[PDB]
Every structure is written in C-alpha cells, then in structure tokens.
Amino acid sequence: ENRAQVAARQHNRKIVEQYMHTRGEARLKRHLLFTEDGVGGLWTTDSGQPIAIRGREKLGEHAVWSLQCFPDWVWTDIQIFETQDPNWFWVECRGEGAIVFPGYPRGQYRNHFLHSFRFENGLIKEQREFMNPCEQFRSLGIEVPEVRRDGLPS
Amino acid sequence: RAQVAARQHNRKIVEQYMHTRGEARLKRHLLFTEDGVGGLWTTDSGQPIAIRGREKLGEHAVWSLQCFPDWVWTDIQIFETQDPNWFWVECRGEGAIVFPGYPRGQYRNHFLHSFRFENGLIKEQREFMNPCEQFRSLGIEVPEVRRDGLPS
Numbered sequence: 001e002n003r004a005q006v007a008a009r010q011h012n013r014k015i016v017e018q019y020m021h022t023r024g025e026a027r028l029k030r031h032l033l034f035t036e037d038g039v040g041g042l043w044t045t046d047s048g049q050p051i052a053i054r055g056r057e058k059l060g061e062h063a064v065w066s067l068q069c070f071p072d073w074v075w076t077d078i079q080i081f082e083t084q085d086p087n088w089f090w091v092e093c094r095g096e097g098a099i100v101f102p103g104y105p106r107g108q109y110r111n112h113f114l115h116s117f118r119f120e121n122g123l124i125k126e127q128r129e130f131m132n133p134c135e136q137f138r139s140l141g142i143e144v145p146e147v148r149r150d151g152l153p154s
Numbered sequence: 155r156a157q158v159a160a161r162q163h164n165r166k167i168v169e170q171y172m173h174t175r176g177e178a179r180l181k182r183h184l185l186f187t188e189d190g191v192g193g194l195w196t197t198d199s200g201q202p203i204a205i206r207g208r209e210k211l212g213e214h215a216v217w218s219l220q221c222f223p224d225w226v227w228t229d230i231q232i233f234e235t236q237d238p239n240w241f242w243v244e245c246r247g248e249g250a251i252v253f254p255g256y257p258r259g260q261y262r263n264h265f266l267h268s269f270r271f272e273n274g275l276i277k278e279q280r281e282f283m284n285p286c287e288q289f290r291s292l293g294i295e296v297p298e299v300r301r302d303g304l305p306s
C-alpha cells in the first residue's frame with residue numbers, strides 16, 4: 001500500500017512541476033495534464049463565487065483566451081508542498097505578466113498565489129487558484145477601497 | 155526519527171490553534187515562539203499586517219475579542235507537508251464583525267493558513283483570504299471588473 005502511495009505522490013509531484021513551469025505556447029497543451037472531467041480556475045474573485053472551467057476540452061479552449069489576455073504570464077518563486085494525501089498538493093508562488101483585458105488599458109499584473117491540486121489516476125482532477133483580487137484591480141486601474149484605520153490599533 | 159517526531163507534535167499545536175475559541179483566545183499567543191509572527195497576508199493595501207512577538211500577539215488578541223467577539227473556524231482541513239515544521243490549513247471562518255467606525259455586521263470567508271514551527275512552537279502564522287468578502291461585511295462597495303468582453 002505504501003509503495004503505491006509513494007509512487008503516486010512522486011508521479012503527481014512531477015505533474016505539478018510541469019504545470020507550474022508551463023509558459024508560452026506550451027500553455028495551449030496544459031489541459032492535457034487534467035482528467036477528461038477535470039476542473040480548474042480562480043477561487044478568489046470580485047463577486048465571491050469561483051470562476052471555474054469544467055472539463056478538459058473547455059480548459060483547452062480557455063487557454064486560447066488566456067494567451068491573449070495574459071500573453072507572457074510566468075509563475076515564479078515556486079514552492080511545492082506534498083501532503084499526507086498522495087493525491088493532494090499545495091503550491092505557494094508568485095506570478096507576473098502583462099494583463100490585456102477588453103476595455104481596460106494594458107497593464108502589468110503581479111500577485112502572490114496559492115494553488116490546490118487534487119489528482120485522480122495520475123492526472124489533475126481539480127486545480128484551484130487563490131489570490132488577493134485587490135492587486136488585479138490595481139493592475140487594471142480600478143480603485144481599491146480602503147478600510148479606515150483610525151480606530152484600529154497601530 | 156527526528157522529523158517524524160516533530161510533525162506529530164506540531165500537528166497537535168495546529169489543531170489547538172484552530173480550535174481556540176472564546177476567552178481561550180487570550181492565551182493563544184502561548185503557542186508561539188518568543189519572537190513568533192502572526193497576521194493577515196491579504197489586505198487592502200497590498201502589504202501584510204503582521205503582529206511581531208509573542209507579547210504583541212497577546213495584546214492583539216484583546217482587540218480581536220472585541221472586534222470579532224464570537225469568531226469560529228469551521229470546515230478545518232489540516233495538511234502536513236514534507237517539511238515536518240510546515241503545515242497548511244484550509245478552512246472557513248465566521249462571526250460578527252464589530253470594526254471601529256463601521257456598522258456591526260456578519261463576516262464569513264474562506265481561509266488558507268500557513269504554520270511554520272521552531273522547537274515545538276509556531277514561529278510564523280500567515281492567513282490568506284479574499285478581502286472583497288470583508289469589504290462586503292463592512293458595507294464597503296466592492297469594485298466589479300467589466301465582464302462584457304470576457305468569455306461567458
């Protein structure tokens with residue numbers, strides 16, 4: 001049993017590494033790292049609800065959009081965490097690139113990210129991304145509200 | 155042996171931290187090293203708000219019990235890692251928010267916590283969430299990214 005779990009964790013780690021280092025035109029094939037019904041997307045949004053892309057095929061189609069709106073995106077400072085579940089990994093990293101959203105000025109986006117990767121049979125079943133949307137607001141020229149700090153300890 | 159022993163003890167401390175509620179929050183700083191750091195890494199400013207030192211952490215807990223008087227963490231999932239001294243926690247949290255100068259409200263959010271250990275106690279705790287939900291709980295307007303040109 002431990003041999004099978006050990007093997008799964010070593011294999012899944014290699015897929016996480018591959019995912020995190022995928023840049024440029026290779027992003028068009030990142031969806032092959034997922035199960036046929038795998039889900040990926042952004043769990044921290046302006047609205048409160050995740051924006052998730054469901055299915056390997058739709059993930060490949062979303063990649064076409066991503067190469068237009070995040071044309072040169074890179075993940076940096078990658079730290080991969082194995083867990084007691086051989087099929088569950090977390091990643092702490094940063095990310096950076098141009099942001100080219102419709103109807104907004106071209107900007108430069110930088111942020112800190114946490115990723116969750118859950119695996120089934122050697123491929124990604126669920127990827128979720130967590131960040132602070134305030135930095136994406138700033139990259140688009142959108143005003144970020146401020147919590148008044150006068151009454152807080154300081 | 156040395157790594158295994160550390161991880162089992164450290165997991166107990168993470169569990170204790172995440173289940174500390176009510177007046178026991180006033181003693182939660184005793185789970186940290188003398189120079190331990192805790193705080194919020196996802197803010198409105200872009201910089202962390204970190205509380206530095208076990209003594210300042212205990213002082214901050216007094217403020218926290220006033221402003222989050224009934225706070226609980228829920229849906230707690232603790233992740234050990236290949237570092238026996240590094241743990242991650244996925245959870246939710248909820249309770250009243252009583253912030254200076256804002257209407258009393260109810261705050262609910264999803265959280266990730268990072269716990270790094272030194273010699274049996276927490277050296278660094280970091281909390282990550284979506285500040286837009288805290289804005290909502292305070293009655294602060296959340297900006298909206300225009301979707302019109304985005305796939306839907």
Ligand SMILES: O=C(c1ccc(Cl)cc1)c1c(-c2ccc(O)cc2)sc2ccccc12
Nearest residue numbers: 041042045046051053133136299304305306
């Ligand atoms: O970057 C993103 C985003 C969301 C989900 C994914 Cl999978 C990737 C980027 C965001 C939006 C988006 C929605 C639909 C769409 O097809 C493309 C982008 S809307 C919004 C709002 C706030 C923060 C981030 C985003």
Ligand SMILES: O=C(c1ccc(Cl)cc1)c1c(-c2ccc(O)cc2)sc2ccccc12
Nearest residue numbers: 147152153154193194197198203205285288
């Ligand atoms: O809840 C918090 C917060 C920040 C740090 C900790 Cl340790 C706990 C709560 C926030 C602020 C705060 C700053 C100083 C202070 O002594 C008390 C609160 S300012 C702000 C801004 C946006 C989101 C959350 C917070």
